[PDB]
Amino acid sequence: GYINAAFRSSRNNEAYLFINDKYVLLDYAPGTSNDKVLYGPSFVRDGYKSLAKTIFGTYGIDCSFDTEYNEAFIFYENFCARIDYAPHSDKDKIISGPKKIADMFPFFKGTVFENGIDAAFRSTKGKEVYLFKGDKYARIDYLTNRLVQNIKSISDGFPCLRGTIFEAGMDSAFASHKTNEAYLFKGEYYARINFTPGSTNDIMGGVKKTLDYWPSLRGIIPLE
Amino acid sequence: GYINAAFRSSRNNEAYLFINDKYVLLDYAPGTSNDKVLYGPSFVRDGYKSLAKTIFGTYGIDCSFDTEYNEAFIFYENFCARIDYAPHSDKDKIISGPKKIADMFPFFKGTVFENGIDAAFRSTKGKEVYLFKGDKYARIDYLTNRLVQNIKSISDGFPCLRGTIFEAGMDSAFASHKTNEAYLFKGEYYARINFTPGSTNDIMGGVKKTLDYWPSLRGIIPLE
Ligand SMILES: [Mg+2]
Numbered sequence: 387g388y389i390n391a392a393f394r395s396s397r398n399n400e401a402y403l404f405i406n407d408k409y410v411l412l413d414y415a416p417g418t419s420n421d422k423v424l425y426g427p428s429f430v431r432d433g434y435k436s437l438a439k440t441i442f443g444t445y446g447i448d449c450s451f452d453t454e455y456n457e458a459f460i461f462y463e464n465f466c467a468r469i470d471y472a473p474h475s476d477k478d479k480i481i482s483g484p485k486k487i488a489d490m491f492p493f494f495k496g497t498v499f500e501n502g503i504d505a506a507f508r509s510t511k512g513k514e515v516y517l518f519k520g521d522k523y524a525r526i527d528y529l530t531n532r533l534v535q536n537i538k539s540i541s542d543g544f545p546c547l548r549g550t551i552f553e554a555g556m557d558s559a560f561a562s563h564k565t566n567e568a569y570l571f572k573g574e575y576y577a578r579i580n581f582t583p584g585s586t587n588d589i590m591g592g593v594k595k596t597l598d599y600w601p602s603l604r605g606i607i608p609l610e
Numbered sequence: 611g612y613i614n615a616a617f618r619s620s621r622n623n624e625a626y627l628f629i630n631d632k633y634v635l636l637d638y639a640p641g642t643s644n645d646k647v648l649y650g651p652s653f654v655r656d657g658y659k660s661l662a663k664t665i666f667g668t669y670g671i672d673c674s675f676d677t678e679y680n681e682a683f684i685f686y687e688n689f690c691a692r693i694d695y696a697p698h699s700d701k702d703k704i705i706s707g708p709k710k711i712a713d714m715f716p717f718f719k720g721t722v723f724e725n726g727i728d729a730a731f732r733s734t735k736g737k738e739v740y741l742f743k744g745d746k747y748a749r750i751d752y753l754t755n756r757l758v759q760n761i762k763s764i765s766d767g768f769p770c771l772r773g774t775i776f777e778a779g780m781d782s783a784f785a786s787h788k789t790n791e792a793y794l795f796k797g798e799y800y801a802r803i804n805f806t807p808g809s810t811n812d813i814m815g816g817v818k819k820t821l822d823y824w825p826s827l828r829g830i831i832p833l834e
């Protein structure tokens with residue numbers, strides 16, 4: 387019962403985390419340890435009315451990423467959708483979907499990503515997004531719907547992850563408001579990283595226990 | 611693009627059939643020539659406002675069956691839902707779901723129905739329903755949620771189909787208003803049969819070209 391998906395909000399220093407069929411709105415305070423729950427833990431179906439009579443409302447979200455504006459892609463196994471999350475408001479809507487990952491992102495056809503994606507996060511470069519499944523990762527442009535480069539092993543693109551738990555996969559992720567920094571999650575552990583679009587660079591440097599640094603999540607994970 | 615699902619309507623001699631992501635309402639006039647179309651072909655997402663933003667609105671219904679009153683279960687791959695189709699009106703709604711077949715019908719877990727059901731039809735006996743997948747068939751009770759008997763080959767429970775093309779599978783089916791008669795479909799063919807609960811019987815003779823006997827379906831199937 388750990389974090390399965392997330393995406394950073396348009397509101398500064400804010401992110402949405404998904405656990406089982408629920409979610410929380412956090413002030414994650416990247417340059418601090420005083421992160422706090424702004425909303426939730428709440429059922430996706432209650433907080434997101436537009437998702438209530440859909441599989442996402444029933445089972446939750448297992449992968450996601452923010453695009454731009456108040457929009458983001460959400461996934462649940464084979465299926466995905468593009469929604470307006472309408473932060474600190476009540477007007478969430480579905481824009482595209484629910485449809486299979488293969489119809490939303492054709493280029494994923496025949497790939498390991500077709501039946502589900504483990505995690506993803508918004509890049510700083512153009513409309514680029516990094517996505518992960520197993521020990522593999524993809525780099526796409528969601529605006530033009532293109533695979534920017536070949537699918538590679540995670541370590542090919544993020545070398546600093548070699549030897550760590552993130553080497554073989556990642557349960558969840560989201561991009562920070564601090565430029566070129568992102569957060570990864572797996573088991574009871576998490577990482578904060580500084581990535582470089584198109585380049586191979588390696589930091590940051592303390593795979594940390596999640597609850598020791600995120601106090602706003604005490605009693606929210608594990609959720610079983 | 612042939613019929614992939616159907617269910618009997620509470621309204622006399624009326625049945626809904628699903629083709630691709632569309633559907634048609636029909637007076638199928640069992641023992642008469644005035645076999646005609648009442649509504650559609652129309653997109654599911656259009657005819658059913660309650661399904662506009664669901665996977666069913668996107669891909670259609672691949673299997674279903676009426677239960678009691680104005681309700682029916684509809685499926686799409688491993689997912690399903692119980693809806694109130696509100697015959698001849700605007701007021702349709704999702705009653706339960708959508709959830710996985712495994713979660714709506716726990717007894718299907720581990721069986722070949724878990725990830726999808728080909729077709730089904732309501733029995734006249736109690737709250738029982740027959741469902742088909744491949745060359746196997748199931749007999750269940752949807753109120754008490756149980757398999758009434760071990761799943762077995764279609765020919766074992768429906769001997770009259772041995773030899774016929776339905777021996778190995780059914781694209782679709784629905785029960786007739788005339789007692790113990792059901793309609794089965796596969797490709798350009800169909801068959802009207804007389805079944806008897808708790809027994810193994812023939813019959814009704816004549817696997818026929820569907821368009822040959824359903825004047826109202828010309829122009830509708832095959833849907834291309
Ligand atoms: Mg995940």
Ligand SMILES: [Mg+2]
Pocket residue numbers: 613614615672673727728729780781782
């Ligand atoms: Mg079917």
